[PDB]
Amino acid sequence: PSIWGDQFLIVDNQVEQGVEQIVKDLKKEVRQLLKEALDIPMKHANLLKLVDEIQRLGISYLFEQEIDHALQHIYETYGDNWSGDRSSLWFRLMRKQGYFVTCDVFNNHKDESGVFKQSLKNHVEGLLELYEATSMRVPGEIILEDALVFTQSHLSIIAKDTLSINPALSTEIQRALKKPLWKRLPRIEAVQYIPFYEQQDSHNKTLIKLAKLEFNLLQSLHREELSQLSKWWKAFDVKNNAPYSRDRIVECYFWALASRFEPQYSRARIFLAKVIALVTLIDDIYDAYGTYEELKIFTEAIERWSITCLDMIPEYMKPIYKLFMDTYTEMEEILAKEGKTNIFNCGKEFVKDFVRVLMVEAQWLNEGHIPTTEELDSIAVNLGGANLLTTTCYLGMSDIVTKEAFEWAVSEPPLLRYKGILGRRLNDLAGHSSSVESYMKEYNVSEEYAKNLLYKQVEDLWKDINREYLITKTIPRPLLVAVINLVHFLDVLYAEKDNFTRMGEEYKNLVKSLLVYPMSI
Template sequence: MSIIGQAGSRITTLVSAVCNVNNNNSHGQNHHHHHPTTYHRNKACRSNIHMEKLIKETKQVLYKMTSEDQRDQSLVMIDALQRLGIDYHFHDEIQSILSNHDAFKEFKNNKDGSFKKELIVDIKGLMGLYEASQLNMGWEDSVLDEAEEFSSRFLKSWMPNLYDHREVRLVENTLKYPYHKSLARFMANDFLKDFNGFKGSWENIVTELARLDSDMIQTLHQKEVVQVSKWWNDKGLARELNFARDQPAKWYLWSMAAITDPKFSEERVELTKAISFIYLIDDIFDVYGSLDQLTLFAKAIERWDFRMVEQLPECMKICFRALDEVTNEFSKKVMNQRGFNPVHIIRKSWSSLCNAFLIESRWFASGNLPNAEDYLKNGIISSGMPLTLLHMFFLLETNINSTMAANDMLNDSPLIFSSISTILRLSDDLGCNKDENQDGEDGSYVDCIMKDQKGCSEEMVRNRVMMMISDEWKRINRECLIYSQHFSPIFMKSCVNFARMIDNYYFLIAENTPYDLIWDKLWYSMFLLKISFFR
């Protein structure tokens, strides 16, 4: 590997580490315990013993690589661990190697600060530089804007001239799914295909560990999605509200993608329950209720008033009663585990969501789109992401009172909530995604801008929206790199994972992937199972 190539691996590793912050401490979480048969229990025990052996061997290899003469090889190894999604086993060892490590300077000339000419013909170096550019925080003098333009331009120019299919796939995946904006497990299988390109003594150990870890995670998530499906079926909401979506496995995928540490099994299941009601209530507003019914429903949620609900159709009564039950159960669990009862904050957040849905219903019923600013302000809330992140906050944070006070969460939504929600709203509007079970009509931010600014072409507006999404990613980077002390590391990492899931999901939409195949691809790429397995 050339010096530039080493710098490429080095900077890619640093990119990987920035927002994959410490999540080793699970803060004394309560977790589900399953009771397998004796055969499966013994098999699992043998696998666990073998995994522990491999983890110990990998730690020993990493420890030996702390010397300066093996620093570059250690970074290649860390990059592999992170891309395979198994770095959570080695947080302390990785931090020890990465501390005080500055590699970006190796891409530039010392004299004039321009990019080294050697980079133009060094594909690994260009890929590393492109990965580094994704950490852009939006400073006016940021060299990372220049780095992204430089590296992407030359990587694209190389594509027609590459004859090695492996290299073509590597460059394509780098441009489509840069590590910082992608879910590690979403890309792990592709990375594993190319893993034979690494010739370290640690290769076999890491490959075997990745296989065992993947088997363990796959088994765990299968149990979780079955648990979610059982909860959903027991609620009977799909039968009673047959106009609404009935997709618990797909809703679970969001929780699974965001909260990746195996320890947080109960938290993934609980978060999925909240997400399911966001979809359910969205369908009530989108395809079922009249404007008068929806107005009364939103008012009943705002007051949390059972008497008001009695005036509504049966399906709305059922939904409200189920929502009340789930909210109370969730709040009781948080109270027992954290000593804080979030019931009033959660109810207020559900009210905000319903009011945002109602505003949209009124806009579309009138046939008049709002201006772009009003649309986006409301659309951030109606995306459901602020409510989702609030639930996740209560599930993952330990010092809830002090953290809420530090972020003024009683009066305002944290910036990272707003950025992720904006990315979701704008990405959804760009994709103009239509779920197969939805018949409601939606406007979009693109439509609103084109109404506000006559003469703008759709292409111009879409490019502008993509730049807005890029700016929100820069804000997320600032929150992670500068203001990360505002929240716990595990919560920050899970927030960024939501943004990554959005990026990966809507990129598949942009490639015109059929709706059902998107979910199968996301699921299969991470766990080698099609989502239809759970239907």
């Protein structure tokens, strides 16, 4: 059952008067800061720092043009040859922006003896910058594999030593060691970074005031979205209309919110959450409930994609097919009015593909066929929902979708394949040690060794995904960002258990920090 009750059903958006004025003035100040730092090359390191703070404070959506232009100008001016302060920051922000800069910049972090310089060890800020840069590494980048070992060991020591000297700094180092910035969802970083930034002695007062006010305003919008979604879901009366399924609208919304958290994507988030709810209902049918004969019929009904075939369908499945059809038809009509029927029809085929693969898995289970890692891998883009989630984002972001973006998805790009394989590995490893014990058999290895071997494959996949991210230019950047966020979300979803089907506690508290508790003042 859902642990949230009805707290999100109705929204109480209490807003303070004139906040719009405050925020507008604060905005003008931040633009000027960006302008001042971009205009003078000696301040370019300072510019990179300001961009990082805007991003981590969670308010990049207010300065999208300014940031993109700033990073573009930095890339145009220096290319691969940055040699100022904050070289580790430069490297990470460039790769985050999609520029595949090389590691050559890190050569000078090393001694004449060919080992990392002793002075790096005394500079916590520098160590953290270097550490965070390692998370952007692709396979085979030895200097970053080495930097990761180096920073981890020295940062662990520093965090222990600084506990009694500066406990907030100790905490910030430990937060990074537990999960690097790049892997953390942007909205989650904002909730955690805001209070650390605020307690820093040198912090920019304008930036933190804006970040906290905006955090609260955007949290209000997220609450508005979840209210609409909760009313939508309640109307469906799942208790009665599918008692065998999960009541998880909050969880569906939390997943959609990972894709893009920004105000610009409000309607896309809502649509995506509905599709995740549908997927959930449907997966629950192909998994526990439905008999093989019924599943074959439903699969066929989905192929027909018409309310007119509602009579060919098993009775318990009818309400689900009706919700499904109503939901997709509403989007179909929106896209038609926008002259984007071509886009809808493309998305439609991927929904069909999701259902067809559910049926394949149901055939195998029927036959008593155990699928090869190879067979699974070839089915990866579709099984885990990688294709469905991605293309649902396409439908939600119609205005920027191109033919090339659909051409790309139809390609079975490595990026989406990797997403599916990573999702399955993470899920196996947290409970669909059920997949771990079968691995001990194939290689005849202890549990300790097996876990390590599997962790290594996961780490490899993160690096493979990084490479694909930096190399993929055919899809509009905002959609590529949604994809990478969805990939990183897998780590939250399967962090300690399958948090969707169950609820580990760390997951509970992320939700509350995003949706329940407003920044103070």
